[PDB]
Amino acid sequence: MEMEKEFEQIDKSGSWAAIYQDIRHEASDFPCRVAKLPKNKNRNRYRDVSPFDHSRIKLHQEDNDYINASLIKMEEAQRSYILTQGPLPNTCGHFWEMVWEQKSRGVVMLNRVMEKGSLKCAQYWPQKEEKEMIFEDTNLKLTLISEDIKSYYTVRQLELENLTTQETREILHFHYTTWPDQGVPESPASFLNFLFKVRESGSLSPEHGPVVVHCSAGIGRSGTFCLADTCLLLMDKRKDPSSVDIKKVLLEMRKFRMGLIQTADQLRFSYLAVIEGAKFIMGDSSVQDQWKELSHED
Numbered sequence: 232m233e234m235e236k237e238f239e240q241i242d243k244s245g246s247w248a249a250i251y252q253d254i255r256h257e258a259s260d261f262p263c264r265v266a267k268l269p270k271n272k273n274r275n276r277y278r279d280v281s282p283f284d285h286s287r288i289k290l291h292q293e294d295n296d297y298i299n300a301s302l303i304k305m306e307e308a309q310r311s312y313i314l315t316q317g318p319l320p321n322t323c324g325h326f327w328e329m330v331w332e333q334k335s336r337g338v339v340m341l342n343r344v345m346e347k348g349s350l351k352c353a354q355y356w357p358q359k360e361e362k363e364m365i366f367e368d369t370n371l372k373l374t375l376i377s378e379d380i381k382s383y384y385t386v387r388q389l390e391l392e393n394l395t396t397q398e399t400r401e402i403l404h405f406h407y408t409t410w411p412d413q414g415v416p417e418s419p420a421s422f423l424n425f426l427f428k429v430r431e432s433g434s435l436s437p438e439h440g441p442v443v444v445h446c447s448a449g450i451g452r453s454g455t456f457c458l459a460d461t462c463l464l465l466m467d468k469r470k471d472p473s474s475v476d477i478k479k480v481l482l483e484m485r486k487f488r489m490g491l492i493q494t495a496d497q498l499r500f501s502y503l504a505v506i507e508g509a510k511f512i513m514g515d516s517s518v519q520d521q522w523k524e525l526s527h528e529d
């Protein structure tokens with residue numbers, strides 16, 4: 232703020248850690264009473280990552296409305312996201328229920344099922360057309376319709392059906408497969424190429440429910456993705472890159488879910504992504520093709 236001048240200053244002084252720790256210190260603290268109820272213990276993947284009560288997504292069921300998911304409602308930018316953990320073997324039904332009830336068109340997955348030798352996410356979508364999934368608890372059917380596999384991400388068309396009404400919806404699944412846990416994308420280009428693929432699909436548009444974004448905990452990689460997207464949208468409103476204060480935007484997001492952006496290098500990457508993305512916002516449409524080439528997506 233102005234972001235590029237600030238970036239160079241932080242870099243020169245090597246103060247990313249300090250800047251980041253300051254963000255952690257200033258971040259909102261709100262209760263997560265529901266997340267911590269004994270009955271919800273097996274609905275949380277990580278003991279120390281919980282949705283705030285005020286912003287949690289409620290499932291539309293009388294039995295137990297709890298899922299570890301938060302609505303990030305960015306008022307100034309006029310965009311909302313649902314950030315959630317990687318579903319557990321017992322919460323895959325809840326996950327798709329949330330997708331249905333919230334009217335989401337897209338799901339953005341930023342992790343792999345196995346990372347660092349451990350299971351980070353349930354296999355919550357079908358990998359083969361002929362082997363659809365039925366979630367008996369929430370009465371939903373999920374079918375793989377097609378997939379487009381690129382070098383570092385895959386886009387799937389899924390059909391989600393409410394078996395109670397027989398209504399069906401197409402859900403687009405955007406799976407980034409090369410973003411390491413507690414790490415950063417290979418380049419601003421690869422990240423932005425993917426973000427713009429999600430944008431171009433219509434998944435982020437106001438006529439749909441909020442896009443669902445997740446990684447393993449739904450805070451580190453998910454937070455980075457949403458921060459970059461929101462900053463670029465804010466810039467787009469006024470065509471005024473200088474008006475965007477990335478740290479303030481992140482603090483605003485953290486009012487809705489804890490721990491968004493998990494490392495100083497993820498914060499630094501967010502600046503890189505927004506600064507590079509600004510080229511497109513400010514009218515250099517050709518830069519999108521450059522990102523595609525540099526991403527080596529195939």
Ligand SMILES: [Mg+2]
Nearest residue numbers: 358359360361
């Ligand atoms: Mg086959």
